[PDB]
């Protein structure tokens, strides 16, 4: 999940 | 929760300082576009724009303290909500156009079919900023209330989550009152600005769910490219 | 415009008066659990509360100023977030339930049986409970729908007429005794609460449209002329 | 010519 991810960073 | 405990001032300037950077599309006046061209030129700026937004959220006070699902469901509710009332501020200044970016200023003559009623919406949503006058500590406001808002209607856990956004909802609105009061309005005057601001956000949910219904409708025929993270954005509301 | 020379008061009273009943449904004693039949009692309510809504809309104060023209324009805006308000409104004393009419009161596993509905449904359930937890009151919910009805297709009358309500549901706050500070955090609850009725408006339009595409349920002409509206 | 002409008029 792209926005998932992005959120982590 | 730093965001219950941040005075009006310290909320504003929060907000502020977290504004995200204002991006140029590809547009070249050299090049010839066609309807779907010119599409690809706001999906492509909206697809940058959206790694910013991000950033953004995360320091919106009381965000950064909910999980990550809730994050992620906030942002997939409002990120076109968030794009349109950005759209809308920077158009302010100049009547009849919408700048999507610094070098992509449109009137509303390649709108595809039904698109340019949106168009005229935004441009409506625009010069209605432009009469109130509307200010950017106001502006930043706003628009961290579309990202809490959005989205917020089993566990608690969930019930816990929903209630801080509430709370962190209520400061806003104090910060709103805030800065009217500061401005010199009367009490009656602080109330009518509240209100003609946050109606306003019912138009912006509106026109956001009109512009994710031409997105449906675009990947469908697709032509015009979408990002693999519109995509998902997109699953989402479907 | 006699609308600007109302008192809080007289604004309160004029729009509790304008209120229209609560219709009922067919009396058969079947809980749909079908597309078809939840779809036909649907409609048949909702096109025998449109009449009613259309004589509502002009006793609030300010509408009747308008051209025949933009009245049109406004009640085909919000009709169905009109409906929807109204719903969640008789539905906040049956928590998990919504009440269609008082002989046709749903719960979530009767949406769950038509395909996307049950989405629309728990947004229903979920305003409703916030309706509730936030004690709203006849008077507030009054307020509410005629600055739905003059808001949603807005797009300097009406916005003065709006600047009333506001200040009338500010009075309603303040005679209820709450501070200032609770007023306006209560204003500015109760006003993003539309644009989540704004939302689920734009989603069960879509549902109305797919409706008149999959066929199946007849519209009538008034309801396919609203829907053909938002086209 | 729409339903809701007529039925906004007295
Ligand atoms: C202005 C309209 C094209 C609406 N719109 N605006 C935008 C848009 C893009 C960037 C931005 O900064 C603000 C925007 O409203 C947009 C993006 C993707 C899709 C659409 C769509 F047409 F489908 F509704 C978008
Ligand atoms: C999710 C649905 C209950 C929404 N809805 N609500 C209503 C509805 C009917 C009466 C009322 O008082 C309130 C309503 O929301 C409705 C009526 C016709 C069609 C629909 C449809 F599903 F297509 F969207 C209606």
């Known amino acids: 999940k792209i926005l998932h991810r992005l959120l982590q960073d | 929760s730093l965001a219950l405990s941040l005075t009006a001032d310290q909320m504003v300037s929060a907000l502020l300082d977290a504004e995200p950077p204002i991006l140029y599309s590809e547009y070249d006046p050299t090049r010839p576009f066609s309807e779907a061209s010119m599409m690809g030129l706001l999906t ?14 995360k320091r919106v006070p009381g965000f950064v303290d909910l999980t990550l699902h809730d994050q992620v469901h906030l942002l997939e509710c409002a990120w076109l909500e968030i794009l349109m009332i ?32 949106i168009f005229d919406m935004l441009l409506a949503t625009s010069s209605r900023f432009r009469m109130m006058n509307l200010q950017g500590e106001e502006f930043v406001c706003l628009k961290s209330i579309i990202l809490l808002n959005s989205g917020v209607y089993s566990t608690l856990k969930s019930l816990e989550e929903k209630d ?25 005057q602080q109330h009518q600005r509240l209100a003609q601001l946050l109606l306003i956000l019912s138009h912006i949910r509106h026109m956001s769910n009109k512009g994710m219904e031409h997105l449906y409708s ?14 998902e954005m997109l699953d989402a509301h479907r």
């Open chain 2, 164 to 188: 801080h956004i509430h709370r962190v909802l209520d400061k806003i609105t104090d910060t709103l009152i805030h800065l009217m009061a500061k401005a010199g309005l009367t009490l009656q």
């Open chain 2, 86 to 117: 950005g759209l809308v501020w920077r158009s302010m200044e100049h009547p009849g156009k919408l700048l999507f970016a610094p070098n992509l200023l449109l009137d509303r003559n390649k709108c595809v079919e039904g698109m340019v009623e």
């Open chain 2, 44 to 57: 492509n700026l909206a697809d940058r724009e959206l790694v910013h937004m991000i950033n953004w959220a």
């Open chain 2, 218 to 231: 675009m990947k469908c025929k697709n032509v015009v490219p979408l990002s693999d993270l519109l995509l």
